[PDB]
Amino acid sequence: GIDPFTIEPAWERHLQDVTLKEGQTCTMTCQFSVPNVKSEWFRNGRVLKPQGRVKTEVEHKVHKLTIADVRAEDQGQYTCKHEDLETSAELRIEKGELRSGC
């Protein structure tokens, strides 16, 4: 028969929409079927570069975006794209005092 034991690129777990308060470290993850491959990150359409708060990590299949001490400006629907295949999630900073304090 077929039995595809080989793993063709797939966005099996799409980027997840994270909502948090400022100052927290973010980690937006997504599962790209291919082991140890890199991808281009986009924040609101813009190519994301791991500068300052941002760190671009990659696991076996899952790709992660680490953002230490996030701000409301660190939002911007993140898209993890590997050439052809892409995924996206809206990053949301909630925020302030009401329902976002202690």
From Swiss-Prot:
Part of the whole protein covered: 9631 to 9718 of 35213
Subcellular localization(s) per the UniProt record: Cytoplasm; Nucleus
Post-translational modification: Autophosphorylated.
Entry remark concerning the domains of this protein: ZIS1 and ZIS5 regions contain multiple SPXR consensus sites for ERK- and CDK-like protein kinases as well as multiple SP motifs. ZIS1 could adopt a closed conformation which would block the TCAP-binding site.
Gene expressing this chain: Ttn
Subunit structure: Interacts with MYOM1, MYOM2, tropomyosin and myosin. Interacts with actin, primarily via the PEVK domains and with MYPN. Interacts with FHL2, NEB, CRYAB, LMNA/lamin-A and LMNB/lamin-B. Interacts with TCAP/telethonin and/or ANK1 isoform Mu17/ank1.5, via the first two N-terminal immunoglobulin domains. Interacts with TRIM63, TRIM55, ANKRD1, ANKRD2, ANKRD23, and CAPN3 through several Ig domains. Interacts with NBR1 through the protein kinase domain. Interacts with CMYA5.
Official protein name in the record: Titin
Residue intervals of the Ig-like domain: 7-92
Record family assignment: Belongs to the protein kinase superfamily. CAMK Ser/Thr protein kinase family.
Organism (species): Mus musculus (Mouse)
Cystine crosslinks: C30-C80
Function, as annotated: Key component in the assembly and functioning of vertebrate striated muscles. By providing connections at the level of individual microfilaments, it contributes to the fine balance of forces between the two halves of the sarcomere. The size and extensibility of the cross-links are the main determinants of sarcomere extensibility properties of muscle. In non-muscle cells, seems to play a role in chromosome condensation and chromosome segregation during mitosis. Might link the lamina network to chromatin or nuclear actin, or both during interphase.
TPR repeat start-end pairs: 38-71
